[PDB]
Amino acid sequence: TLLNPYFGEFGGMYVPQILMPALRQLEEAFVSAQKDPEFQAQFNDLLKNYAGRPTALTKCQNITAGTNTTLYLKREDLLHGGAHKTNQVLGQALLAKRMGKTEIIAETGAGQHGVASALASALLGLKCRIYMGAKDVERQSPNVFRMRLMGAEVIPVHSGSATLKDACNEALRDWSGSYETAHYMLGTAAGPHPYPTIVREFQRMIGEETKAQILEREGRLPDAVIACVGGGSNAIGMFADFINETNVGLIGVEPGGHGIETGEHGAPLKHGRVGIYFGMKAPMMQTEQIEESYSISAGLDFPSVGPQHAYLNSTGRADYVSITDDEALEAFKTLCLHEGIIPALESSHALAHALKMMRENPDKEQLLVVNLSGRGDKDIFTVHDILKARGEI
Amino acid sequence: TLLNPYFGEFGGMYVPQILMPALRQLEEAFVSAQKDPEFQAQFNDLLKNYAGRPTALTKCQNITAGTNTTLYLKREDLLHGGAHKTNQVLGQALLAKRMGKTEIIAETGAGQHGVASALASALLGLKCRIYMGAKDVERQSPNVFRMRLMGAEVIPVHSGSATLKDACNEALRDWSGSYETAHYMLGTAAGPHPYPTIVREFQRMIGEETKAQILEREGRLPDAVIACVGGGSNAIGMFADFINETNVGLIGVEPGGHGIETGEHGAPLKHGRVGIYFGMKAPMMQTEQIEESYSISAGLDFPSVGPQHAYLNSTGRADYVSITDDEALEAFKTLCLHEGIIPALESSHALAHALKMMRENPDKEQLLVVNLSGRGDKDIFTVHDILKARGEI
Numbered sequence: 097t098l099l100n101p102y103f104g105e106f107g108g109m110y111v112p113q114i115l116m117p118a119l120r121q122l123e124e125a126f127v128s129a130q131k132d133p134e135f136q137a138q139f140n141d142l143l144k145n146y147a148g149r150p151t152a153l154t155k156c157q158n159i160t161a162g163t164n165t166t167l168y169l170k171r172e173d174l175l176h177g178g179a180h181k182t183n184q185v186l187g188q189a190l191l192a193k194r195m196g197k198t199e200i201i202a203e204t205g206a207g208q209h210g211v212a213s214a215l216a217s218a219l220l221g222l223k224c225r226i227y228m229g230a231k232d233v234e235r236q237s238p239n240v241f242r243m244r245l246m247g248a249e250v251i252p253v254h255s256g257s258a259t260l261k262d263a264c265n266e267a268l269r270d271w272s273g274s275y276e277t278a279h280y281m282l283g284t285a286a287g288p289h290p291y292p293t294i295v296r297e298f299q300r301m302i303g304e305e306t307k308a309q310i311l312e313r314e315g316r317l318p319d320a321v322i323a324c325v326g327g328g329s330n331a332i333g334m335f336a337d338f339i340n341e342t343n344v345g346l347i348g349v350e351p352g353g354h355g356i357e358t359g360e361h362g363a364p365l366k367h368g369r370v371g372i373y374f375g376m377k378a379p380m381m382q383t384e385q386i387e388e389s390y391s392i393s394a395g396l397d398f399p400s401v402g403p404q405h406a407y408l409n410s411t412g413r414a415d416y417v418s419i420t421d422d423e424a425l426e427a428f429k430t431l432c433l434h435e436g437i438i439p440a441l442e443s444s445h446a447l448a449h450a451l452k453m454m455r456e457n458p459d460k461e462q463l464l465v466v467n468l469s470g471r472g473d474k475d476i477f478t479v480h481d482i483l484k485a486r487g488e489i
Numbered sequence: 490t491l492l493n494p495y496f497g498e499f500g501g502m503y504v505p506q507i508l509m510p511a512l513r514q515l516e517e518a519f520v521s522a523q524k525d526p527e528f529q530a531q532f533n534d535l536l537k538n539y540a541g542r543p544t545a546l547t548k549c550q551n552i553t554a555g556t557n558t559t560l561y562l563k564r565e566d567l568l569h570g571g572a573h574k575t576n577q578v579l580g581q582a583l584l585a586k587r588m589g590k591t592e593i594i595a596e597t598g599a600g601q602h603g604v605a606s607a608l609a610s611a612l613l614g615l616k617c618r619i620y621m622g623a624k625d626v627e628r629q630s631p632n633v634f635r636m637r638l639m640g641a642e643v644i645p646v647h648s649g650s651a652t653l654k655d656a657c658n659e660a661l662r663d664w665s666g667s668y669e670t671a672h673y674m675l676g677t678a679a680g681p682h683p684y685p686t687i688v689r690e691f692q693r694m695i696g697e698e699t700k701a702q703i704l705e706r707e708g709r710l711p712d713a714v715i716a717c718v719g720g721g722s723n724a725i726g727m728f729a730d731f732i733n734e735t736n737v738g739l740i741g742v743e744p745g746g747h748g749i750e751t752g753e754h755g756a757p758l759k760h761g762r763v764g765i766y767f768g769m770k771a772p773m774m775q776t777e778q779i780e781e782s783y784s785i786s787a788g789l790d791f792p793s794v795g796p797q798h799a800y801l802n803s804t805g806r807a808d809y810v811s812i813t814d815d816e817a818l819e820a821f822k823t824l825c826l827h828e829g830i831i832p833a834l835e836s837s838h839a840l841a842h843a844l845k846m847m848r849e850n851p852d853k854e855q856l857l858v859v860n861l862s863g864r865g866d867k868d869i870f871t872v873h874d875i876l877k878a879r880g881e882i
């Protein structure tokens with residue numbers, strides 16, 4: 097194994113022996129490609145002319161009116177597909193073609209990573225198959241339809257609890273015996289090494305572009321960069337290029353759920369315990385066994401966190417807070433009403449925490465940047481249902 | 490009146506005397522702003538950092554594989570909001586603030602222009618009210634909800650046939666008496682002068698960026714630029730900067746409907762007759778009185794066409810074809826399956842006509858550019874219903 101599979105005591109490769117070759121071989125191919133500028137050349141061609149990079153940086157004056165905070169939104173919502181997932185997905189698609197693979201295996205919970213994979217595969221022309229828990233397949237008709245229109249095969253998983261965990265497990269069993277011709281496109285910066293690394297490297301351009309844009313527009317780095325954290329891909333992708341700029345804030349917002357003190361949430365980082373999950377060793381929400389997570393937001397509905405985040409958390413380089421279903425919903429409505437932008441419910445947690453920092457210190461002089469990971473069009477149904485059940489139509 | 494209100498025998502200002510002042514005053518304000526670079530400075534700041542301009546240019550190699558056609562898609566689908574409408578809307582919002590107006594009046598059929606106006610108004614902080622036929626208000630819950638989340642007031646119109654025509658008429662009656670403090674944000678390159686002009690000028694950057702990008706990437710202008718035509722805003726916006734490059738094709742695709750020979754369509758340009766409609770004099774679909782149009786696509790469901798298009802058509806500078814519900818649906822599915830992009834059903838007509846030009850002449854050496862006016866996420870429900878009714882699930 098070329099690279100180090102751990103970040104502190106976190107990360108690793110806790111996967112059956114049958115997967116070591118597939119994992120080791122992926123890592124090599126990856127290193128070999130990181131160093132090949134022909135690859136980098138293609139990757140950037142795709143990110144630039146297909147996905148639409150670089151993504152804007154927006155100054156939200158209306159939202160900060162009457163305070164001393166200056167707020168910027170890194171517009172990942174404007175990327176092709178609607179969210180930051182399109183970055184890493186185009187990366188691995190290429191990587192896979194490089195390794196001469198002819199197929200993609202992926203798993204999705206609500207279909208956000210599913211649609212992303214289907215799309216990358218359509219482009220790079222790879223036979224895509226996406227595992228999805230049956231319960232979710234029923235709850236997500238549109239995205240299932242999207243994946244099908246994009247020529248991907250959605251395989252409903254009925255074992256276990258017929259949900260994300262199960263779809264995830266089955267995906268890996270698939271790959272175990274098909275890694276010869278199929279690349280396993282993991283949806284986030286977690287899982288066994290080298291994924292946490294590969295995903296960080298394939299998302300790090302958002303942090304890069306941010307710094308550049310922030311200089312051109314403010315002549316100085318931000319006091320902090322805030323981003324929601326599920327498995328941690330969009331947060332690490334924004335963090336990366338700032339770990340070094342030590343006087344820059346690195347805040348990660350995890351879902352508060354129904355209240356970090358109800359069990360119904362997903363902030364294992366600050367309220368769980370280290371264990372091995374999804375092939376990695378990191379903090380997670382355990383019973384005594386693994387437990388359940390929750391959020392109005394499905395993307396943030398992860399019971400664990402990426403190894404590098406658990407690490408940056410223990411060293412104290414990055415801070416990790418929590419925002420709840422309602423504070424997120426509030427932010428979601430706020431951005432809609434003042435900036436004319438519908439944020440994804442996931443990003444709403446980060447925008448929420450920013451607003452919190454401003455409303456509590458209107459006189460404080462701060463330059464903040466929230467990573468708007470995706471657009472919220474795919475969440476109006478949900479928001480509308482809640483607002484209706486809450487009796488506010 | 491400063492500018493000339495006609496394009497050949499088309500265009501004009503056929504509106505009640507009460508509207509001449511409001512119309513004349515808009516025109517002036519517009520000219521004064523065209524010439525003010527402080528305005529241009531703001532407009533471009535908005536288009537660049539809020540909407541995400543410039544929009545990509547994508548080479549669709551997979552779609553043209555095995556032919557001599559080179560196809561590019563001007564990615565208007567990647568603009569904030571999902572379609573080219575966001576350009577002109579941000580323009581008029583500014584113009585209105587410039588004229589010291591505090592309110593926006595608009596009308597929408599399916600809510601695409603409604604959501605756009607609501608958004609521009611949220612940003613530039615203007616009190617937005619959008620008229621919408623009651624029938625449509627029922628058929629368009631999501632967009633109605635979007636407009637409401639963006640703080641706009643949707644006023645259902647129940648007179649006449651409770652649809653677009655009626656919502657449109659009521660909007661103008663509103664403006665008739667409120668132009669003092671309310672700007673009427675017309676949704677397309679049609680209507681009484683100066684709208685056809687203002688909308689062309691506020692969309693012309695797509696054609697501009699295209700030419701620039703096409704040079705940088707091909708070292709030569711395209712043989713043709715193809716775009717769907719409803720009222721004509723996205724087509725003119727692409728055409729504009731190419732009218733002069735005479736050896737460049739200017740194709741406009743109108744909806745074929747159920748077949749240009751069934752009456753159930755919307756290609757008044759090539760199959761109607763000149764009359765006065767929506768305050769302008771242009772070709773339209775008349776009974777003997779005005780008639781009905783149709784398309785799987787609501788955006789293309791217009792019984793008339795913009796005055797400049799009728800003009801460019803008579804001089805023969807630009808060609809106008811027709812594509813049907815099925816050819817569009819076919820294109821829609823094709824782009825999905827090979828490029829991993831879901832086109833808006835409207836743009837599908839233009840992509841359709843392009844594919845037609847390639848499949849019929851695989852050996853012909855051609856460089857084509859289709860204006861992908863919007864993303865098709867807001868059309869999967871429709872496509873899914875058709876495919877299901879057609880019994881293909």
Ligand SMILES: *Cc1c(COP(=O)(O)O)cnc(C)c1O
Binds near residue numbers: 284
């Ligand atoms: C999927 C998703 C996420 C959560 O994933 P990370 O791996 O923490 O980035 C965040 N935001 C959006 C909009 C997403 O779709």
Ligand SMILES: *Cc1c(COP(=O)(O)O)cnc(C)c1O
Binds near residue numbers: 721722724836863
């Ligand atoms: C509204 C719309 C159109 C039709 O309008 P034009 O005024 O002819 O541009 C075309 N494409 C998309 C995607 C639209 O939303």
